């Protein structure tokens, strides 16, 4: 009878992550105490709560929590994808393999991205950054703490993107035309997450993450609606291209100009190595070149989009 279990496992690949994570949750919840004195508290909840105010430090329990949510997102990917999306697409009368699978991962993209984008916008709304107030980037710099929602979001994004990266490394069967710059994008995204976390400034990271999410949301929506019978995919793509320029390139130039001038056209760049205050001619070039890589790749994607627009409206 265990052969039927193997068959289910191969057809449905989410049972093992589900089983392990529900074991962790059951053991933690039924433990009686939900305080930090546990270790499952280390693996499930954010650590380093400053006293009992709303502020959190860093450490290694962050990596532990990242690994646990690495498992949770793998489970969610498999379970959601198969169980909900696949029958849903089958009902949508579009019958192929290439198109149906592409739609599969585009609709999964829509789901998590619509979860994340508005959540991040909520996080930014409850901040001094309101609508990308780039002056707060130069408020407290060596801030060794972030608010609860801010950090849980942060690490949620870290865990998710690293999980897509590792699935990419696993090299399942067939990337697709557009893979090399894609893995460049994911690698530099993970480097941006980890660097902008471990160098104490996440205020400068959050706006870019918002831009990425709300761009990819509309991209995936328009792509999957084009893959389905369109009706109005052209207007959706128009909304997408306007939002794409307006948010991605406008906001990224806004951030880059602001960082370069505001943090450079000053006299405040000196080391003072205890207070980790190396917001100077050292950390700047690093994060600057990372952001430049992102923006450069965004321009390349823009050129591709412009080519698509010209080709479509040329015929």
């Amino acid at each position: 009878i265990w052969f039927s279990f193997r068959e289910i496992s191969y057809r449905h690949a989410w049972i093992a992550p589900l089983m392990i994570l529900i074991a962790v949750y059951s053991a933690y919840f039924t433990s009686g105490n939900t305080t930090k004195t546990n270790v499952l508290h280390r693996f499930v909840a954010v650590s380093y709560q400053i006293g009992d105010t709303n502020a959190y430090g860093k450490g290694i329990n962050d990596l532990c929590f990242v690994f646990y949510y690495m498992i949770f997102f793998t489970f969610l990917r498999e379970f959601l994808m198969d169980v909900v999306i696949r029958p849903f697409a089958i009902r949508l009368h579009v019958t192929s393999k290439h198109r149906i699978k592409r739609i599969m991962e585009q609709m999964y993209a829509i789901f998590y991205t619509g979860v994340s984008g508005p959540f991040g916008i909520y996080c930014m709304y409850h901040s001094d950054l309101w609508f990308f107030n780039t002056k707060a980037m130069y408020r407290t710099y060596p801030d060794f703490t972030n608010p609860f929602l801010f950090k849980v979001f942060y690490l949620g994004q870290a865990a998710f993107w690293a999980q897509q990266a590792c699935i990419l490394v696993l090299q399942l069967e067939k990337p697709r035309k557009d893979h090399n710059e894609l893995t460049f994008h994911h690698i530099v995204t993970l480097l941006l997450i980890w660097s902008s976390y471990v160098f104490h400034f996440t205020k400068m990271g959050l706006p870019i993450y918002i831009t990425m999410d709300v761009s990819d949301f509309l991209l995936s929506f328009s792509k999957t609606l084009n893959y389905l019978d369109s009706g109005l995919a052209f207007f959706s793509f128009a909304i997408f291209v306007v939002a794409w320029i307006y948010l991605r390139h406008y906001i990224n130039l806004k951030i880059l100009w602001s960082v370069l001038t505001q943090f450079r056209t000053e006299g405040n760049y000196v080391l003072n190595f205890a207070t980790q205050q190396y917001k100077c001619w050292i950390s700047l070039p690093i994060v600057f070149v990372l952001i430049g890589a992102l923006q450069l790749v965004n321009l390349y994607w823009l050129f591709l989009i412009f080519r698509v627009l010209y080709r479509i409206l040329w015929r």
């Binding site: 990596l63 590792c166 490394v169 696993l170 090299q171 980890w194 471990v198 000196v270 080391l271 003072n272 190595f273 205890a274 980790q276």
Partner: protein, 132 residues
């Protein structure tokens, strides 16, 4: 497949560990980034230590580099040491200007071997003479 994943994951985790250790270590021992120990010998084996640094490296850099230099340079098991550390009280903890004058020096310490121990006893005015 799997082995490539383990290779790249191990490289990533090694890089993370490398940068975190960089953070921790350089935060602990920063004094040889901003304070420079200038030594001036006296008549015999006894020398004058002080820390000549930037505005940032305050009396922490000074004191830590002096103690480290004393316990580093002079091996005891041949002949025991004797030193004194006299504090500059006319100065606030963080006191250097960025331009290369740096004015007054803060901590300053004398250290030598017991053969000319009388010299260090005389040279240290009243502060406790630490024979180690």
């Amino acid at each position: 497949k799997i082995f490539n994943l383990f290779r790249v994951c191990f490289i990533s985790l090694l890089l993370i560990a490398a940068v975190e250790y960089f953070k921790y270590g350089t935060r602990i021992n920063y004094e040889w980034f901003h304070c420079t120990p200038i030594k001036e010998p006296q008549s015999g084996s006894v020398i004058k230590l002080w820390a000549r640094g930037g505005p940032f490296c305050d009396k922490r850099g000074e004191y830590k580099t002096i103690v480290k230099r004393i316990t580093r340079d002079y091996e005891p098991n041949d002949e025991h040491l004797s030193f004194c550390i006299i504090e500059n009280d006319n100065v606030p903890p963080v006191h250097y200007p960025i331009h290369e004058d740096k004015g007054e020096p803060g901590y300053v310490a004398y250290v030598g071997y017991d053969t000319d121990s009388e010299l260090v006893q005389e040279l240290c005015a009243d502060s406790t003479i630490y024979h180690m």
